[PDB]
Design brief:
Number of strands: 2
Largest sheet: 2 strands, antiparallel
Name: Omega-theraphotoxin-Pm1b
Shape: globular
Order of helices and strands: EE
Strand content: 5-15%
PDB class: toxin
Entry title: The solution structure of omega-theraphotoxin-Pm1b isolated from King Baboon spider
Strand order of the largest sheet: 1-2
Keywords: Inhibitor, cystein knot, Voltage-gated sodium channel modulator, toxin
Assembly: monomeric
């Protein structure tokens, strides 16, 4: 996850690791999207 203005959100459809915010995480093939990992559950 990269810290940049306009980072992708949940279920964005990322492909790389540093594609979404630093808090989100990109999964492998099949369901490659920005998921929650490390953040506190609301």
């Amino acid at each position: 996850g990269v810290d940049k203005p306009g980072c992708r959100y949940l279920f964005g459809g990322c492909k790389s690791d540093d594609d979404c915010c630093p808090r989100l995480g990109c999964k492998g093939k099949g369901h490659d999207y920005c998921a929650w990992d490390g953040t506190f559950s609301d």
